[PDB]
Amino acid sequence: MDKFRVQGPTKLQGEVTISGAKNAALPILFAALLAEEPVEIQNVPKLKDVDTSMKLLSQLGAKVERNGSVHIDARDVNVFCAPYDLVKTMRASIWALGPLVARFGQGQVSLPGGCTIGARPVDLHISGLEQLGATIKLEEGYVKASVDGRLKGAHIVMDKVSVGATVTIMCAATLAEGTTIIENAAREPEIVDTANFLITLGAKISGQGTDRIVIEGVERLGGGVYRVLPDRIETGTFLVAAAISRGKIICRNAQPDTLDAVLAKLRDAGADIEVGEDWISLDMHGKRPKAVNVRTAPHPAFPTDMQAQFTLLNLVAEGTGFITETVFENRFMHVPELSRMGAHAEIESNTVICHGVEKLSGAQVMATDLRASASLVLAGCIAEGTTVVDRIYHIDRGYERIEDKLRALGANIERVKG
Amino acid sequence: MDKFRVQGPTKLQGEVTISGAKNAALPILFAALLAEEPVEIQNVPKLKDVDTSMKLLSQLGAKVERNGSVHIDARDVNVFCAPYDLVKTMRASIWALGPLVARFGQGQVSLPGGCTIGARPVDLHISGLEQLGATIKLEEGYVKASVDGRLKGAHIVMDKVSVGATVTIMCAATLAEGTTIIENAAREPEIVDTANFLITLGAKISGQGTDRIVIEGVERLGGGVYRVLPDRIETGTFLVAAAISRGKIICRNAQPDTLDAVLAKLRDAGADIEVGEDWISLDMHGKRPKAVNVRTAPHPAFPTDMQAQFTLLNLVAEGTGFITETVFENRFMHVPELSRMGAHAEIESNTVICHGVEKLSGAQVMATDLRASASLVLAGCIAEGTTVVDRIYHIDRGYERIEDKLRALGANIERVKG
Amino acid sequence: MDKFRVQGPTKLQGEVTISGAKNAALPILFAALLAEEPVEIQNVPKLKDVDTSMKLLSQLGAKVERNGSVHIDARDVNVFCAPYDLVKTMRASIWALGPLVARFGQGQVSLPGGCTIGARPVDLHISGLEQLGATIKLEEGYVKASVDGRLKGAHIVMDKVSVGATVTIMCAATLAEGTTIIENAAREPEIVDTANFLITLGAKISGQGTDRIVIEGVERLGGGVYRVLPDRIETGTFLVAAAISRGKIICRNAQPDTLDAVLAKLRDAGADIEVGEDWISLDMHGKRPKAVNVRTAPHPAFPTDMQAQFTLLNLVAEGTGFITETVFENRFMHVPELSRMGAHAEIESNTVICHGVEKLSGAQVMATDLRASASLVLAGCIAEGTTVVDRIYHIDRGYERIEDKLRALGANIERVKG
Ligand SMILES: CC(=O)N[C@H]1[C@@H](OP(=O)(O)OP(=O)(O)OC[C@H]2O[C@@H](n3ccc(=O)[nH]c3=O)[C@H](O)[C@@H]2O)O[C@H](CO)[C@@H](O)[C@@H]1O
Ligand SMILES: CC(=O)N[C@H]1[C@@H](OP(=O)(O)OP(=O)(O)OC[C@H]2O[C@@H](n3ccc(=O)[nH]c3=O)[C@H](O)[C@@H]2O)O[C@H](CO)[C@@H](O)[C@@H]1O
Ligand SMILES: CC(=O)N[C@H]1[C@@H](OP(=O)(O)OP(=O)(O)OC[C@H]2O[C@@H](n3ccc(=O)[nH]c3=O)[C@H](O)[C@@H]2O)O[C@H](CO)[C@@H](O)[C@@H]1O
Ligand SMILES: CC[C@H](O)P(=O)(O)O
Ligand SMILES: CC[C@H](O)P(=O)(O)O
Ligand SMILES: CC[C@H](O)P(=O)(O)O
Secondary structure, three states: OOEEEEEEOOOOEEEEEOOEOHHHHHHHHHHHHHEOOOEEEEOOOOOHHHHHHHHHHHHOOOEEEEOOOEEEEOOOOOOOEOOHHHHOOOOHHHHHHHHHHHHHOEEEEEOOOOOOOOOOOOHHHHHHHHHOOOEEEEEOOEEEEEOOOOOEOOEEEOOOOOHHHHHHHHHHHOOOEOEEEEEOOOOOHHHHHHHHHHHHOOOEEEOOOOOEEEEEOOOOEOOEEEEOOEOHHHHHHHHHHHHHOOOEEEEEOOOHHHHHHHHHHHHHOOOEEEEOOOEEEEEOOOOOOEOOOEEOOOOOOOOHHHHHHHHHHHHHOEOEEEEEOOOOOOOOOHHHHHHOOOOOEEEEOOEEEEEOOOOOEOOEEEOOOHHHHHHHHHHHHHOEEEEEEEOOHHHHOOOOOHHHHHHOOOOEEEEEOO | OOEEEEEEOOOOEEEEEOOEOHHHHHHHHHHHHHEOOOEEEEOOOOOHHHHHHHHHHHHOOOEEEEOOOEEEEOOOOOOOEOOHHHHOOOOHHHHHHHHHHHHHOEEEEEOOOOOOOOOOOOHHHHHHHHHOOOEEEEEOOEEEEEOOOOOEOOEEEOOOOOHHHHHHHHHHHOOOEOEEEEEOOOOOHHHHHHHHHHHHOOOEEEOOOOOEEEEEOOOOEOOEEEEOOEOHHHHHHHHHHHHHOOOEEEEEOOOHHHHHHHHHHHHHOOOEEEEOOOEEEEEOOOOOOEOOOEEOOOOOOOOHHHHHHHHHHHHHOEOEEEEEOOOOOOOOOHHHHHHOOOOOEEEEOOEEEEEOOOOOEOOEEEOOOHHHHHHHHHHHHHOEEEEEEEOOHHHHOOOOOHHHHHHOOOOEEEEEOO | OOEEEEEEOOOOEEEEEOOEOHHHHHHHHHHHHHEOOOEEEEOOOOOHHHHHHHHHHHHOOOEEEEOOOEEEEOOOOOOOEOOHHHHOOOOHHHHHHHHHHHHHOEEEEEOOOOOOOOOOOOHHHHHHHHHOOOEEEEEOOEEEEEOOOOOEOOEEEOOOOOHHHHHHHHHHHOOOEOEEEEEOOOOOHHHHHHHHHHHHOOOEEEOOOOOEEEEEOOOOEOOEEEEOOEOHHHHHHHHHHHHHOOOEEEEEOOOHHHHHHHHHHHHHOOOEEEEOOOEEEEEOOOOOOEOOOEEOOOOOOOOHHHHHHHHHHHHHOEOEEEEEOOOOOOOOOHHHHHHOOOOOEEEEOOEEEEEOOOOOEOOEEEOOOHHHHHHHHHHHHHOEEEEEEEOOHHHHOOOOOHHHHHHOOOOEEEEEOO
16 A cells, blocks of 8 residues: 655645546547447546556457557457456446447446445446346346347436446447437536547437437447547646645646536635636635535536545635535545544535634545545645655546646655555 | 525414325325226325326326316226336335236336435335235336236235335235235324225225234225325424424314324423314414424334424524434435524434524525425524525425415515526 | 443453354354254354344254254255244344255345344345356345255455355355355454364365465265354453453453454553453553544454444543444444433544543433444443443343343443333
């Protein structure tokens, strides 16, 4: 277990270049199982989840290689059982199931891992795929899916909003016979990106980014080149880093329209924000943030993947702020870790009530999941003294070179063995 | 999203006439799928859930009409697949499954909605129906049930207490061959009402209201007229309205024996209560309540559907009071909303620790579920200033004309578009 | 509902003799379904769970008798459906399923009860058994398993650590054809004990106590005599009893190597500990404990079954201590009960933050589960005045003669009807 050792307080100031989105790179990598000619995916972050997906892909029979891009040749996929050891390490592995079924008529994928922030069922993926014509059973721990012949498109009303199940159904639909309509579709920018990737390959899709997507199945998808959009959560995290540290930053290679709610909330906190076409600047003008209220919800509302980060901002802000998490039922694990650093929070139900303090103290804390870990490192940067964040591998699932990026803003961080 | 705008403080005083029970009207409406002659159900509240059930019923092929009564002619039911869009909006839709199977040999119902106050599985309904002889599978999101021929009665020990699964098994049993015994049956007054409805139709049932119900199957049920019992929770809510507001009320068209535990607890809080045959009066004699301790449990203990309401009473009472919720695992969502109004609560596990304050403050709050919403409106009536309760549609699931009823007691409420 | 009435404060001092482990006696009793000659199991505690298991065993066709030992003759097992009424009362009943399948080719067991400290799924047991070749379905509430012929050994990587599913797979593997490897196996001392029991009977097992167990199936198991190891949790509870009461104790018939983490934590709390080969002594030298931090995890880390107990120690200790529960998601029910006795705890997520007080007060409290109940009795022993712990039957699931043992240390306890 690597740990980060952080020494504060430090103010965070400067610039950062945003990497491709974790959560777009991932569904695109799996969507490439559909492709029957080679694909190049540009602007792909170097993340643990990306490495594992490439390995998983390779074990199905794909030819895979990366640099700034990931190259995938999926023409000769010939294994339909995903490797369990890889699947259990992340959420995104669930996305092998859909394409394997749609293209090959069968697939077997065990239940995913990922962030331990809820029970995280996959029932809507399974329901969707069944509505498209698949037969599914859970056996030995695998989700085992099949269909004789093609899937058949269907009108599918999603019972609840779900990013991942939207991707599964949209992807599988691209090779079904007929038309699929997804109602109550997730609107996240990563589904738009995924959809636009698919279209590059020859898919017929419209409505992505709205609550309804329409897909007309085609016989085969081709190949192509596609560049992944910037990471909005990595963006938001670095904007929070400057905001809590009374700083200023510019974020380069950004996409500001994927952050409306976040930027507004940062303005509410007292931040001076400007945006251009592909960059965002934040300036606190030396001031401590003001407390804000937040309620998480699906895009384009305030994102659950920025909740932990805003927890911390509210805990060193001026005032009382209320943060309500509606999307996941166990995503306050960062809170007691913050309380070990002197924070004043109280949880009531799905809400953390935060009373901001001027300064935190250094402490031995432990990362529980990707965004909690980032949050605890940011805490360590502004806290007095030394913080040791244990189990920092979590961070590497979602941030390329966080240590380097933060270092470049002024942080004093060390990565340490154990 | 309609909202309520409330202006306080206001004292609540006067009288109210209690409507039929939400939670008896609902299972009776679905039980009427059994009937092979027309039925008249009297004293049926005008509630969102009732409207939806009538529409659902009509889509199966029933002829349905209402005024003070709902009229159902179920003779020509000929669709066995319930409409998903209606089913997802409420709990009660689960009750279409049992009667469809018992009478027609098949039925398909997707998973219900309703109050977001727990995971709310339906496994005991499915287990019960299987014990009666049904074959069940979950596929595309539906619970799909069938049996060749009649169900067969069985001795069924309910693994845990459940209102809804008691109703499902009791209802389905009425057309099975032989005798069914339900052990560990729920005893709620709405199951008694349901049972007595069924008996009006020709069912052979005994033991309702006790922990064991015995049903002897008959070949067919007929028709009839039946009046739904008063709503105990609407009763309790209005009694709490007067209790927290230092008031006095009489509740007309009430059934006081369905409220033993609630009335005792209201006496513990300092209320002067009297009861007659069909009415209940409460007088606080101008005083602020005293804090009480409460533990929810199945009937005839203190009901979970009054828990939110008593949360509020304890938060403006004199003293420290402990409220333990044992029935549902996510039914404290009203708590942080109350804390936004200045309440002093702390949650520990399944318990809210409440330290009563003299006055609340007006605040923008949001309703999460039916009884939380009612509670937040009551809070708004006694709070200083303006409260806006967002997402008030929740209330209309369970209260007919709440705005009008409260207005008649002195409240200053406005319903506002959005 | 029996209750305990406790009068404090009382200091707890003296000696105690530790009984056999609840949680080894239980899996061994069920493992004995494998045996085709008689078995004698020595040092078996007199516990409610043991009584129920013997009755369950007898209803499958075993001949069962006990004194200090339990005698089992399983040669004529001839019923494969476990009695539901017995199964629902405890966790351990799940362990009938594996042996019935491995030896007889079929078995039907409803879902277990036990401690209400989480959802407690059995999916890893079912997945494991399927990997060994079983066919499984859930129907009428039963887990129904079968295989034609023997099971076949498999390489099984356990998706998460699980004590019970490790036992199920290891036990069933003893009669499969070929070799089974369990990776990510639970290492608890009770799995070692179980494994060594099995080996007495002729099983071929190695690796128990490590994260990998290897089993080579044999054709039949025989009989034998085996003595159950001491109860580590009962040990830890009595060590906590003396620690919180500023006392001193010696624990006889103990196994100190099963308690490394606990003993270290007790040293951190200020305890003077000594150990011999089969005994442990603790002396506080008259002092109040110091607060400690704890994080639960699988063996050999700090055990979840001592978490409640250490909650209490931290709440009467000097200082602030943080207790993080990672194993079960609803195991803080003792906390509000402790708060009724004047404790200063706050829960945040999976962590209880404890600020120790000098003295508790007597209160009416209620036991929710086995280890919470023991904890509340210990609280009652050091609290000022009278404590009544309701629903004390929970204690009898895991402690033989707790009342007598504590009495012998100086406690003033009464067991009372209701
Ligand atoms: C790899 C990836 O893209 N991860 C992101 C994705 O996760 P993910 O796709 O897992 O999130 P979902 O939108 O599906 O989850 C939404 C809610 O729906 C539930 N649900 C989801 C699927 C299902 O079949 N059944 C079901 O009940 C979940 O338990 C959760 O409570 O979107 C989340 C919501 O923005 C982000 O936090 C994650 O970082
Ligand atoms: C429409 C209606 O009548 N609603 C009422 C009904 O709901 P409802 O019928 O849903 O409530 P239940 O009594 O069934 O629920 C009791 C507990 O058992 C669980 N459970 C229930 C069914 C099942 O198959 N499996 C299972 O595990 C539930 O998750 C809950 O934790 O009774 C509740 C308990 O008084 C009230 O709060 C609801 O307002
Ligand atoms: C009779 C007995 O021996 N009881 C002990 C046993 O319980 P038990 O065997 O039930 O505990 P487990 O180790 O299996 O449970 C570990 C975690 O894994 C989960 N899980 C377990 C099995 C499964 O199929 N699926 C699954 O998801 C559980 O919900 C829990 O969250 O070990 C626990 C952990 O030390 C102790 O607290 C219990 O006193
Ligand atoms: C929620 C944390 C991560 O983004 P995952 O969804 O597990 O990949
Ligand atoms: C618990 C809230 C409502 O009564 P529902 O059970 O959803 O109809
Ligand atoms: C966790 C409490 C008990 O040891 P059980 O596991 O239910 O036997």
